[PDB]
């Protein structure tokens, strides 16, 4: 009654086992408001002398 039960499958040719679990959560939000204002004017001084 001791736990030195290494009578089968002695793998100590080092055998480094890894694990790498990885989760990720991500939300996002935007609010993009523009507002234009624009006005024009001109003048059209024309002439013709037939």
């Amino acid at each position: 009654c001791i736990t030195h039960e290494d009578y089968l499958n002695v793998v100590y040719s080092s055998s480094e086992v890894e694990k790498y679990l990885q989760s990720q959560g991500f939300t996002e939000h935007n609010e993009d408001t523009t507002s234009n204002t624009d006005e024009t004017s001109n003048q059209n001084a024309t002439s013709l002398d037939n």
Partner: protein, 50 residues
């Protein structure tokens, strides 16, 4: 024109590793995990004479 933006944002991440190693000489240290508690009763609770 004017323009205003509001980029609200959040993240999350939950990593986890479970790396086990198996050096060879740990069983040498594990030979007597129960021996030094079992003879402790011989040291302190039982008549150590014939």
């Amino acid at each position: 024109q004017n323009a205003k933006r509001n980029q609200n944002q959040k993240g999350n991440a939950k990593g986890t590793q479970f790396t086990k190693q198996y050096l060879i000489d740990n069983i040498d240290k594990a030979y007597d995990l129960r021996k030094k508690i079992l003879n402790e009763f011989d040291k302190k609770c039982f008549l150590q004479i014939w």
